[PDB]
């Protein structure tokens, strides 16, 4: 089973939030240059998550996609506040391979199908943010602010039924902690769907990626371990290949 290593870049007003530690770059806070670097050193795909204001957001994301497409050959996903078909369509047409939708998909699950009918299921990444609440995995929207009362188990099944192509599964319980991927959550979701699962949140060291792939993740997404150079992408891939993980070398 082929596995993917994906870098996540949080972006705002066209800048990498909290930048990176790559002194070899002209602008270590330029997401286009940083993304290009990652593609040259072995990252398999990129994910850009935009948290721009709201007034310049739409134009800022379309500019990002245009500049990224000029410079990067590997697939990339854009997400963050994509609320309808026309917004998703413009971003894909401007150059993005995939869009990530979360809040708007929960509030209008037909949006999944709408984008998929024009761009294919493979262009639709449904980002699911989940957290343990009173012993159940619950789905959260609005960057973790709202417990929807929807069970992770039910939403995963519905997401596939609606025609999504991939699930970007973020554990709120682990995101940012460097303590490891939420392998219990990944293993909970794995038998419920045939879709590729991108594991997200908690990456701290190379062994965490092995654990995530054993749990059934098809891809492992991380941000700070890469930006702050705590894990080298090539060393990570050689480590994973050494222990039987089918990564692309």
CATH number for the domain including 11? 3.20.20.70
Count of positions (residues) in the chain = 249
Cβ-based neighbour number of residue 230 at 10 Å: 15
Which range of residues forms the domain containing residue 78? 1-249
Are 57 and 50 within 8 A, CB to CB? yes
**Encoding tokens for residue 93?**
């047409």
Cβ-based neighbour number of residue 240 at 10 Å: 21
Are 181 and 173 within 8 A, CB to CB? no
Method: X-ray
Are 99 and 115 within 8 A, CB to CB? yes
User: Nominal resolution in Å?
Assistant: 1.9
| Selection from 242, 222, 241 nearest residue 180 by Cα | 222
**Encoding tokens for residue 103?**
């809040």
> Has 97 been annotated as catalytic?
no
> Has 129 been annotated as catalytic?
yes
Alpha-carbon distance of 193 to 111, in angstroms, equals 19
Q: What is the DSSP string of 48-67?
A: EEE---SSSHHHHHHHHHHH
Alpha-carbon distance of 173 to 248, in angstroms, equals 29
Alpha-carbon distance of 230 to 28, in angstroms, equals 16
Contacts of 99 (CB under 8 A, 6+ apart): 77, 78, 79, 82, 88, 91, 92, 115, 123, 124, 125
End-to-end CA distance of the chain: give it in Å, rounded.
14
Task: Name the catalytic one among 50, 129, 182, 218.
Answer: 129
Alpha-carbon distance of 212 to 224, in angstroms, equals 17
Cβ-based neighbour number of residue 89 at 10 Å: 16
Alpha-carbon distance of 187 to 170, in angstroms, equals 13
Alpha-carbon distance of 22 to 92, in angstroms, equals 29
Domain count, the chain: 1
Q: 3-class SS at 247?
A: coil
Interior CA angle at 211 toward 20 and 122, to 5°?
A: 70
Phi-psi region of 141 (alpha: psi -120 to 50; beta: other; left: phi over 0): beta
Alpha-carbon distance of 247 to 229, in angstroms, equals 20
The widest CA-to-CA distance across the chain, in whole angstroms, is: 48
Rg (CA), the chain: 17
Task: Name the catalytic one among 10, 44, 97, 182.
Answer: 10
């Amino acid at each position: 089973l082929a596995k993917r290593i994906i870098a996540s870049l949080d972006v705002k007003d066209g800048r990498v939030v909290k930048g990176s530690n790559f002194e070899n770059l002209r602008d270590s806070g330029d997401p286009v240059e940083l993304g290009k670097f990652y593609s040259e050193i072995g990252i398999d795909e990129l994910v850009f998550l935009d948290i721009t204001a709201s007034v310049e957001k739409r134009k800022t994301m379309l500019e990002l996609v245009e500049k990224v497409a000029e410079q990067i050959d590997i697939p990339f996903t854009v997400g963050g506040g994509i609320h309808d078909f026309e917004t998703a369509s413009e971003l894909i047409l401007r150059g993005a391979d995939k869009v990530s939708i979360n809040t708007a998909a929960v509030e209008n699950p037909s949006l999944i199908t709408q984008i998929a009918q024009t761009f294919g299921s493979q262009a639709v990444v449904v980002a699911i943010d989940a957290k343990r609440v009173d012993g159940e995995f619950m789905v959260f929207t609005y960057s973790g602010k709202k417990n929807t009362g929807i069970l992770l188990r039910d939403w995963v099944v519905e997401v596939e039924k609606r025609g999504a192509g991939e699930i970007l599964l973020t554990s709120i319980d682990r995101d940012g902690t460097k303590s490891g991927y939420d392998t219990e959550m990944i293993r909970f979701v794995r038998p419920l769907t045939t879709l590729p699962i991108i594991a997200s949140g908690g990456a701290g060291k190379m062994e965490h990626f092995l654990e995530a792939f054993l749990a059934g993740a098809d891809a492992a997404l991380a941000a700070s371990v890469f930006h702050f150079r705590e894990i080298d992408v090539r060393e990570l891939k050689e480590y994973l290949k050494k222990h039987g993980v089918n990564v692309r070398l």
